Amino acid sequence: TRFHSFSFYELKNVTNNFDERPISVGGNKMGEGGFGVVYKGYVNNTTVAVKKLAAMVDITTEELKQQFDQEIKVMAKCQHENLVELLGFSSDGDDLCLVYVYMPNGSLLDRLSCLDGTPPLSWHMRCKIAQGAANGINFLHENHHIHRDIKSANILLDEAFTAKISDFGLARASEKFAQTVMTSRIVGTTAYMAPEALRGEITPKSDIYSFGVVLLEIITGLPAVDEHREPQLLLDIKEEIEDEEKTIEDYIDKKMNDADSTSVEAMYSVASQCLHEKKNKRPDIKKVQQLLQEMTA
Ligand SMILES: CC(C)(O)c1cc2nn([C@H]3CC[C@H](CO)CC3)cc2cc1NC(=O)c1cccc(C(F)(F)F)n1
Ligand SMILES: [Cl-]
Secondary structure, eight states: OSSOOOOOOHHHHHHTTTTBBBGGTTSSSEEEEEEEEEEEEEEEEEEEEEEOOSSSOOHHHHHHHHHHHHHHHHHHHHHOOTTTOOEEOOOOOSSSSEEOOOOTOHHHHHHHTTTTOOOOOHHHHHHHHHHHHHHHOOOOOOTTOSOOOSSGGEEEEEETEEEOOOOOOOOOEOTTTTTOOSSSSOOOOGGGHHHHHHHHHHOOOHHHHHHHOOOOOOOOHHOOOTTTTTSSSSGHHHHHTTTOOOOOGSSSSSSSSOOOOOHHHHHHHHHHHHHHSSSGGGGOOHHHHHHOOHHHO
């Protein structure tokens, strides 16, 4: 209730038949992941994002349908300025679509890579984005949800670079947040996942680890995994710095002119604490929030 039920044919119309050319070149395609492709549309003068779900990795039709249903359930329960907003969906015929308010600055991942020639994010803007993302995760944890896929591709940016958490298809309710459960279907993005999540545990503490990797992407402007890089995994720079083979200053994004040592070391210190290999030693999201607020004094 509150979401609009669209026919598939209407969404076909407003995306120019899911036009696959990039938006940068006059098409409708904005991005994609393991569970679908996101297209730009216009519905009744409103710019929208339309995610058409697909098995882009190996996933059953039934699992896809459960992710669709979970997205709608979380978005029905959770409204917050640091979460994306669902307008509607379509489930008639074979295809599943979710329709959202459009995010004019795309994904934090794309902005950190300056995809399509966008200017590099200032350190000032990076600090505000880290704070907003932590406020969104805090709202989810306060509402007894575990996200399970926190990463820079799932943190979107509006016209004022307000951070919005997206993609609740893998989210799980936690019984009063305290109690860890096991699953036999291990999901998430390997380069972001806590060790316990890679073993099948489900706990909000795994969201904190993944957020640590996002903070390193913000500091460095490097992707979480790059097969043509040493180290391949960004989280391994933590070990390089701990074993004084390197310093955070060796990894700071060069595409900024406003990064002071003090606030960069403060953000690195939050990231380092989030990336504790032992889940019980990680700060909770409320502490992460406080540390990121103290960082900008
Ligand atoms: C798909 C992707 C990566 O997220 C996305 C990429 C974009 N690129 N741009 C360009 C950025 C560069 C600028 C040049 O100045 C012009 C526009 C706008 C975008 C908008 C996007 N997403 C959404 O609007 C959106 C909203 C809610 C829920 C979701 C969902 F869950 F489906 F991912 N997506
Ligand atoms: Cl996985």
